[PDB]
Amino acid sequence: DVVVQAPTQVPGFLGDSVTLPCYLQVPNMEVTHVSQLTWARHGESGSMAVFHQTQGPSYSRLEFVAARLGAELRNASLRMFGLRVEDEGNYTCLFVTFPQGSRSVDIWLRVLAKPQNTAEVQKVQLTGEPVPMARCVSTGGRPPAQITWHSDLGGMPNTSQVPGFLSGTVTVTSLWILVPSSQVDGKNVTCKVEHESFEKPQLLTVNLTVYYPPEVSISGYDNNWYLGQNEATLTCDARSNPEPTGYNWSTTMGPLPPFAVAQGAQLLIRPVDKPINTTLICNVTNALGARQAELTVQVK
Amino acid sequence: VNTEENVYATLGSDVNLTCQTQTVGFFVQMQWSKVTNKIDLIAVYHPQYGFYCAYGRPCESLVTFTEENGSKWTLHLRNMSSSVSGRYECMLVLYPEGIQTKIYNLLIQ
Numbered sequence: 302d303v304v305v306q307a308p309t310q311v312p313g314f315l316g317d318s319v320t321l322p323c324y325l326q327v328p329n330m331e332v333t334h335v336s337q338l339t340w341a342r343h344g345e346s347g348s349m350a351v352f353h354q355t356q357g358p359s360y361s362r363l364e365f366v367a368a369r370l371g372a373e374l375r376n377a378s379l380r381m382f383g384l385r386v387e388d389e390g391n392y393t394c395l396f397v398t399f400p401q402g403s404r405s406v407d408i409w410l411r412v413l414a415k416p417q418n419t420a421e422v423q424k425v426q427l428t429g430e431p432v433p434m435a436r437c438v439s440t441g442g443r444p445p446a447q448i449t450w451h452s453d454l455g456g457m458p459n460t461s462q463v464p465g466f467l468s469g470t471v472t473v474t475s476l477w478i479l480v481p482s483s484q485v486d487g488k489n490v491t492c493k494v495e496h497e498s499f500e501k502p503q504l505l506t507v508n509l510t511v512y513y514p515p516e517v518s519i520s521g522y523d524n525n526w527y528l529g530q531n532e533a534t535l536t537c538d539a540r541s542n543p544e545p546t547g548y549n550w551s552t553t554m555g556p557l558p559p560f561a562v563a564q565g566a567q568l569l570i571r572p573v574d575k576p577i578n579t580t581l582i583c584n585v586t587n588a589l590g591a592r593q594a595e596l597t598v599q600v601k
Numbered sequence: 602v603n604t605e606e607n608v609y610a611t612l613g614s615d616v617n618l619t620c621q622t623q624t625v626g627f628f629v630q631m632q633w634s635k636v637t638n639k640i641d642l643i644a645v646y647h648p649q650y651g652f653y654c655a656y657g658r659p660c661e662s663l664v665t666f667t668e669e670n671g672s673k674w675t676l677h678l679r680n681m682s683s684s685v686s687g688r689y690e691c692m693l694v695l696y697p698e699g700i701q702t703k704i705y706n707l708l709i710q
């Protein structure tokens with residue numbers, strides 16, 4: 302009924318120290334005599350750490366945290382200082398007991414490294430071919446962190462792995478690829494980074510910034526314009542990144558007639574007593590360039 | 602240290618599986634066990650605590666320890682049958698030589 306209590310795996314961080322738990326659970330009425338404790342690495346020929354009941358400790362860095370001469374050996378927990386990449390592997394914790402014999406457990410040591418997560422926006426213009434608009438970097442992680450994108454827009458990710466600054470670590474860089482459009486600028490895309498060192502997955506959000514020429518539109522006219530009508534107003538609906546730096550009003554036949562007066566981004570229509578047929582043009586200027594929008598105006 | 606060996610015998614045969622070793626210091630403990638689906642312990646010997654037979658009291662002719670700091674850890678099997686066939690492992694704990702292991706695969710033909 303004498304059992305050895307220890308976990309199957311133990312997480313330890315690179316550079317720091319880790320305690321390998323290993324305890325011998327003996328029922329209250331049972332009598333046992335632990336002659337010695339043994340720590341061994343899978344396929345290393347010789348022993349790593351030994352604690353004999355009369356001789357004491359012997360190591361190859363390593364220290365028995367609870368073992369002591371005089372007291373009955375039960376806690377074979379060992380502290381491993383300065384965790385290296387080569388320290389990751391399988392370890393055996395053996396108890397040489399009497400009359401129960403040899404009892405052991407196999408513990409896996411997992412060498413980890415907490416990665417540094419950073420998200421960035423990629424400022425792009427308008428082109429046919431798909432180009433990365435977002436960037437997610439998970440620098441110096443062990444094992445390489447899992448990066449996924451949470452977006453309803455539907456963009457294929459370009460994920461690549463590169464060696465880290467420290468030995469045994471990997472930096473994961475993921476680019477969110479999508480065809481740039483006007484109905485995408487301002488929308489958010491969330492990056493989900495997953496790693497064993499994190500209790501909860503780190504969520505990083507980036508707001509897409511697409512540079513597009515003015516998407517100029519003209520609304521107000523509805524053909525129902527009678528002679529000697531009320532002072533109507535036409536608005537030049539424009540959406541551009543960066544914002545418009547000017548609003549110019551004109552026609553195909555030259556400048557604005559006396560009834561049409563420019564009010565910046567708006568245009569006031571004064572009452573007319575004679576029939577007119579003029580096609581108004583709204584010119585919206587931006588850093589990228591200028592775009593036009595035409596509308597036929599008929600009064601009868 | 603870590604050796605595997607095949608032993609062939611017939612019905613009604615006698616065999617002595619011996620684990621011979623030498624220490625610079627002293628022998629800590631030694632055991633005999635049959636390994637199948639589980640590790641079924643047969644006998645344990647300690648120089649201070651003595652012997653321990655997992656089964657019944659008449660185990661006098663089952664194991665022997667012959668002691669220059671040299672030893673012979675023997676398991677005796679007499680008038681064997683097909684049920685005796687299997688893998689028998691011996692574990693020798695030495696100081697400061699460590700743990701020695703020898704597996705005997707006994708086959709009854």
Ligand SMILES: *[C@@H]1O[C@H](CO[C@@H]2O[C@@H](C)[C@@H](O)[C@@H](O)[C@@H]2O)[C@@H](O)[C@H](O)[C@H]1NC(C)=O
Pocket residue numbers: 343391407408409
């Ligand atoms: C760690 O080790 C466990 C036990 O390994 C067993 O004992 C060693 C000495 C060999 O005989 C081996 O063939 C046995 O399986 C494994 O169950 C476990 O998968 C190992 N961990 C990893 C991640 O490989």
Ligand SMILES: *[C@@H]1O[C@H](CO[C@@H]2O[C@@H](C)[C@@H](O)[C@@H](O)[C@@H]2O)[C@@H](O)[C@H](O)[C@H]1NC(C)=O
Pocket residue numbers: 459461474
């Ligand atoms: C995936 O992306 C590759 C470009 O990789 C990037 O290169 C420079 C510009 C850095 O930003 C770096 O961090 C990136 O890894 C393309 O060469 C490759 O064609 C793309 N994959 C596919 C299938 O198109």
Ligand SMILES: *[C@@H]1O[C@H](CO[C@@H]2O[C@@H](C)[C@@H](O)[C@@H](O)[C@@H]2O)[C@@H](O)[C@H](O)[C@H]1NC(C)=O
Pocket residue numbers: 487489506507508510
């Ligand atoms: C991301 O989400 C929001 C997006 O709002 C827009 O922000 C910039 C890019 C302009 O286009 C502006 O007109 C929009 O309102 C932001 O309010 C929010 O603060 C951003 N959060 C982070 C963490 O970047």
Ligand SMILES: *[C@@H]1O[C@H](CO)[C@@H](O)[C@H](O)[C@H]1NC(C)=O
Pocket residue numbers: 320322324366367376378
């Ligand atoms: C065994 O050792 C661990 C680690 O040093 C300690 O936390 C724990 O109290 C001990 N367990 C028992 C049951 O003695």
Ligand SMILES: *[C@@H]1O[C@H](CO)[C@@H](O)[C@H](O)[C@H]1NC(C)=O
Pocket residue numbers: 549551584585586591593
């Ligand atoms: C629009 O305005 C810009 C800046 O004043 C000018 O260069 C461009 O020629 C204008 N376009 C039209 C058709 O008036």
Ligand SMILES: *[C@@H]1O[C@H](CO)[C@@H](O)[C@H](O)[C@H]1NC(C)=O
Pocket residue numbers: 615616617665677
């Ligand atoms: C060894 O085996 C033989 C039979 O093969 C037997 O006669 C002998 O007594 C055994 N040795 C010991 C020490 O008992």
